[PDB]
Design a protein around this ligand. Sequence first.
Ligand SMILES: [Zn+2]
Ligand SMILES: [Zn+2]
Lengths: 558, 46, 1343
Amino acid sequence: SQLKLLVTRGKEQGYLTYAEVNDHLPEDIVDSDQIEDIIQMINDMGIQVMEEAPDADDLMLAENTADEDAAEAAAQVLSSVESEIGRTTDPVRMYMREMGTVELLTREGEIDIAKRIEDGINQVQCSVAEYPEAITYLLEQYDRVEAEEARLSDLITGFVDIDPELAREKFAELRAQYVVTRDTIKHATAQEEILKLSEVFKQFRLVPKQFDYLVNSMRVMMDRVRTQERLIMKLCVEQCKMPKKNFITLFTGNETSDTWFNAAIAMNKPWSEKLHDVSEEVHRALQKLQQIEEETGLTIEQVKDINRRMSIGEAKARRAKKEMVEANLRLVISIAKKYTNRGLQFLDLIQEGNIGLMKAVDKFEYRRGYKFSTYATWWIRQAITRSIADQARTIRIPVHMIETINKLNRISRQMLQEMGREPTPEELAERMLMPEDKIRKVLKIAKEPISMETPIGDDEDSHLGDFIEDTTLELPLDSATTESLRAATHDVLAGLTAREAKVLRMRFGIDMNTDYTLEEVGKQFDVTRERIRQIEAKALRKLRHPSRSEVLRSFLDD
Amino acid sequence: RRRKLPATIILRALNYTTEQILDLFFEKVIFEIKLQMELVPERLRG
Amino acid sequence: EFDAIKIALASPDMIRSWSFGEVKKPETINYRTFKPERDGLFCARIFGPVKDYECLCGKYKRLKHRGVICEKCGVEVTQTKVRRERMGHIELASPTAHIWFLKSLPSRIGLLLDMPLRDIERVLYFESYVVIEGGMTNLERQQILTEEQYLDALEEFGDEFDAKMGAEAIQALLKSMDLEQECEQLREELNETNSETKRKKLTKRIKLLEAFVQSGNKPEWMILTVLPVLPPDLRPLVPLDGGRFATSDLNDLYRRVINRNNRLKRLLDLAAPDIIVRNEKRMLQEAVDALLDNGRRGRAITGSNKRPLKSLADMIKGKQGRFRQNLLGKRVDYSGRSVITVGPYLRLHQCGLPKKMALELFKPFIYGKLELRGLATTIKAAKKMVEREEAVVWDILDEVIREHPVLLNRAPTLHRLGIQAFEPVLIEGKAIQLHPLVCAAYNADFDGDQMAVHVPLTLEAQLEARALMMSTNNILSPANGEPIIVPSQDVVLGLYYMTRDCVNAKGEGMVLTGPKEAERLYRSGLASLHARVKVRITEYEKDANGELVAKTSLKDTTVGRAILWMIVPKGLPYSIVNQALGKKAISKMLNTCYRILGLKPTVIFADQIMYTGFAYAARSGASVGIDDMVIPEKKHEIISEAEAEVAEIQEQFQSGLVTAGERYNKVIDIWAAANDRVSKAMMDNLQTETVINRDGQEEKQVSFNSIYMMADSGARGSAAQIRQLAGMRGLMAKPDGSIIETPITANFREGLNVLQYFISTHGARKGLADTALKTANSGYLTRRLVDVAQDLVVTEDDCGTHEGIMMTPVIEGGDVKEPLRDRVLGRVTAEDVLKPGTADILVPRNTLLHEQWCDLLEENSVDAVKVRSVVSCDTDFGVCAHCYGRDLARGHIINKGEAIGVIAAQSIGEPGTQLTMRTFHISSIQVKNKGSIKLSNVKSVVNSSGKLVITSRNTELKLIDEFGRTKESYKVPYGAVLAKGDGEQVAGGETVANWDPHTMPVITEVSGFVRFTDMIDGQTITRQTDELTGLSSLVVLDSAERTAGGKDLRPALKIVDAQGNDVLIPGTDMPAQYFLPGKAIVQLEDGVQISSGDTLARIPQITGGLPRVADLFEARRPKEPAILAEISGIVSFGKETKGKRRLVITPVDGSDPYEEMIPKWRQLNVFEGERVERGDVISDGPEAPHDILRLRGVHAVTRYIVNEVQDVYRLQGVKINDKHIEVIVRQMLRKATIVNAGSSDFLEGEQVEYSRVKIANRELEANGKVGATYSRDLLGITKASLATESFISAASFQETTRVLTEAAVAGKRDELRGLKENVIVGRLIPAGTGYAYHQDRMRRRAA
Ligand SMILES: [Zn+2]
Ligand SMILES: [Zn+2]
């Protein structure tokens, strides 16, 4: 205990200097962040931790609030951080700490984790291409872009073979392969025919969006079966206490007909008679399970093996590609140290780098054999500078328009010395080929402009918010002018009769929220808007006269 | 303005030993035998 | 309209309920058109239109479309002022802890989860996994699992193991925590855990738990999941000049949160690796901390400016925050300022307003009166007319200005006479002209001060101005009721010059028919202004039934006193103007006119005094010249004498006879005595001139020298500055406090040479620095006292108590520093006061002791009056009108609804700024008067030789004359050599006591033989062999170097018979042995003939300033607290030196648990067989005030403080009525601690508001059950202000975040009921004319 003697000495003398805390810090902690966190911990007692020997009156003037419960929980803290050394809360320091825990990669380790990614997505495509309705969608997609509803060489990346005629060749390959398998289902070589049907697709080259569509469409056709596997198990083992060996034997393995369930309503058990609770429920799952069998050409247990090939292969490669992502985190931090002081915080530049680093891995091709630290350096050069372009100023500037200023910042700095004293704005019309107005609005744009806690200062500690005036308010001279104009109209319209005042109250919006038109006022009285226009012009001429306009003419600003 | 160290540490880091430090900062009346102390005539005041 | 303001925690559904949409993009505006975006930070679909009744698209721009929502941009056609009040929400993609509920120091989340703060801040920043309802898989719920430990404990356990990190973990902890289930199990273990720390922690947690169930908040609401954004008109994006803009920093913080939430949204859309999403969630949590409070986590992030950003906490908290800087200190229309000038043609009730300022301030008044009379038709015509300022708008404005006060206010508004209302008189020029009498009430001189002038608009505020704030309604100082409109410097020179006689002036010895003849003689130039004549004077006296009995006599006056008699009203006698009439004499004259005649004739009299003083000071021609400083001719001789003396002591320091310290002390004393000698010579040279004569002989008289005429009248300054003009300057100080030993033998009628002028600048620069540093902290104490005393308003007419302090004047030793007529005046008699015959009631009860009653009881020589005090009032949240007394700014009894807490805060603060801002410490009894001696605690013994030595402890001396009142009050030492007997009236000039601090005997009661038993030298005594005479001395020892064989045992001073039989104590069956504490000089022998009262065992041997009134109110515990006698009963010692001695006071009929840890360095007043009652002295020195409240009554810490605070005020000379310290003390100790909880609904260890205790105990005794007893607590005035009831009030002087978090988690309410509450809220105060409005609203609730 030394920091407890620091607490006791501070409350025993009414102050603390920097010398007393620096003599009562422990031996293990080094850097200045944590020790001024400790200064805050002792400073909100508050025992007035300031620099020098304090004055004489300012211990009796300075007050000690609030005894003692904040000091109770601070004693609970300060007698307990005398044990561990690794405590800080900074995401930058803790990010350096949890980033050093991942080692780098070699060249060989990089390409073999890349081929782990390649064989992982190959296992995913093995699970995809082992399903027929994806290739039925491929049939109907090539059919719908046979009418050129899309662009097929943009819908698929040609094929892995540039030309639509060879894209026609491999699709004429498909429909012949499809009919020598599906038409000859009637089961000896039919699954071998689907096998040859599966082989001809794994040399087709597509777009990931037109790849991900059929993956997620069978995903909702997968978890529906996983909902069916939930629909049985949530309502057999716990609903009725049917034992799971009746679930392990009867359902699990067969899964197909209406025999694993509806024959168990005669097992002479509590749960067997309790299946009448769930006989009508899973009869909806007795059809919709086999409806999926009407949508695969296979059985449900063969679907349970298809997505389990898909899930584990995805869980291998996405973990593999994150093992490549985690390895090159030391690369990204070296790049973001060069882009730091241009507006955005340090952790934000980094986290936009790992976003492109994840996207660089998805488009990295190790068959080219270049190093990965040359490919991902392009994306982090984009993604850091793009988020510096997109998300750094309080007023968002479009990305190219930043490059207009950045080219202007790069050129006008160069003509500051290559010309003489200053570069004029009209001189910059000569150097860059922007014609003196699309160069002028570039320099009209502000820069993260001014705070409104901006000290003016030394007036009343006044800030810049104290002197900005609102022009869009209502000054009470104009408002009482407007209010007295409301009553001065009401007395001039007291000098008119029933009809002419009322059209003049509904041609404009006088105590009604329109401003009807000439026919609309004439719609009320069935007049074809001509006498209504005259009786407006008659009453308007009636209000033109002196000693009829003796109050209103003064109401006009003259 | 860091933590304190006892200020003979800065003399020891400058390679001064204990007898050399006392050689610097003190005055030496010497005792001998029987039981004689040589006197400085001013040094007695207290 | 709302009647209460309720604080809670925001539900996430409620945050979405306030919202008008979601902010999704961190764009603010369009950057090209400066237009609001589609879903950006300054959205228009969410917050509204940028222009009033106009869409962003442009289609439905008509005022006919009001209320519709456009189909192209989604905005609603409304006013653009609706985006001042429209919020949106931010649905955060991950939960995030509220940093107010985490990094507060009580840390409500941490205190709630039964986990320390390091636990939750480790889990929240993604280090540790946390078990939430972990089944039965070998774990503990709410446990830290570090990452590797979680991984290897997930092994061998197929259960899902329920371990989260981050705010998902803390949210599922806070949701799954049942508060009331935990309350029942906590009370269940509270049934079986009566320890100290265990029971303390259990009840300490259960307090927040019982509040959290009774509030209605949910604990999962502390973890935020959806974030409210401010309206865009509270973080605006104003377009400035030249294309430049200006935003608030909340825009940057909300942009940071929207950026990190969008990126976290993508990083959880992307199935990223967990470390970068951990870093993203931790970053977003940090951004929420920086947005809500930029700096409670560390560090406060700076933008493109190197100051930290202002966050939402920083927008409510702080000096510049809305709670301080915008809820009270706010600019005001219908106001203006200009400099002040004198213009003394005014009356007391008018200021001189300029004409351009009255044209500007009174503009709507001018418009209404100008078009009502119809000189303009349109308000545009009125605007153009008074912009032209035609010849008629001055007539309309002087019509408007007639009886319409203006609040003239000067800036350091220390008290309520800084704002007074004046009727405005239109002058030209541009300076406010201001009546010269109230310049001493504003402390406003004419070296260029500016007074701000406001206008009261309403008839209620016009009548508040006229009825309270008019400068004639406030002519008594509210601190002490003396008039504050004292004529200050030129008026007193005029009144002193006309009324001060001359020995041979023109027109001596004439006889005039009255003052009319006197003014006719003076104004024609036949008589001088001061010539002793015999004027016939008609002076009226109302010494009857309000009669004004007239009486005409023939007085021996001067001419000018007769001329001044014309302006006197009737009720005053002539002898009040028959004198010199300096400054204090005009103060007493205006005071007499007020006390006799009332308020209006005092105002007319003060105006006529001011006019006559200026006029006859003008006709004085009172110049100042270079021959008005007569340098004394003996000044050269006193300077040469002191130079010869310091030459002699310079020799005797060169000779080594004295050292340099004593030589510096001797030359400082010599030069200061020479400076006093020179000042005495010049002041005797100046105040007596020689004039000649009626008979031609030499005749001394008081000199008409204008510098003496200014110093002696009290016009300006005093004889110290006249010493620095004519006499020598003196010894000059240093900023070190030291004194420059080479003095300044010159002055200011001669010059100063370069050395003395460089010497003077140390003291003058220190004085001006301390002046200009004190004015930057003028009303810090006034602020600190209005915080404690905000909500004290007189609410009751008479509560009907019988208690109160019993007031007696400050007789400290000789004289009385402040008599009874100063204190007991205006207070209410708590009892019936009888005559000294103890036979008839003098003043009945419930009486306002005015000056007639106090004159009566001072004629009856009454001495012990029990006033009605504020600290013993029987009403709640207020005082009654009689337990306070009278108003002192009016002379009447107080009204119902005067804010006496704020008034007393100002009347301690505004006289308190006249105190020094830095603190400063400074044989036989001199028997002078004669009379009877009274003694309390009187148990004396006779001696054989006729002398006396008192053997009772606190027998202090009281001398009474034949008048009842005390004459000489002193502390008699324990056994000092008295020549005083008992009770017999002695004559003055004979010593009553020969004290010696070397003499504290243990003088006997009965005569006899002092033999010694249990007496061993060596282990109890020292070997004391006095060679001095050859006497047997046994001087006893402390616990230092004796044995432990005789340490606990005590030596016997046993006085026995001539045979050796143990004589009894008279009254007590114990023996006669007087066992001794440390260091007693004993001369005894075994078996020597000594008498009763023999000298057996003798024992050997004012701060001022404003920091003292700082430390007296904060109630500091001094480092040497005079320890007391905690309980009545006779005393014994305790354990010898385990660091501290113990001392067991043993009550003869009660238990004795108190063996107090007494240090041996603070020596005993008492012997260890000496009976002292409770509240009696043990140590010597500054008595701690809490010990006065615990032991003695509440009138003994009330009497202690208001005599110790007034010992600071009367030390400097500042007078203040002691109501004002009593309402602060009454609001100080409104805390009681419970000890017997009884059938009352409070805990044992509970500190609560005392007037809630006294009403529950009023009602729970009003049933057939019995109520609690309580021990009163007293606190400091920065700590008493902490425990307010309100949270809107408390957040304006305390730290807002700790206040608002403590208020929110309690689900607290604020029925407003307070001065600072309703001022912020915008209602009437519950004090003033708005008391009846708070009756009118407290009528409709009991409907
Ligand atoms: Zn629109
Ligand atoms: Zn009362």
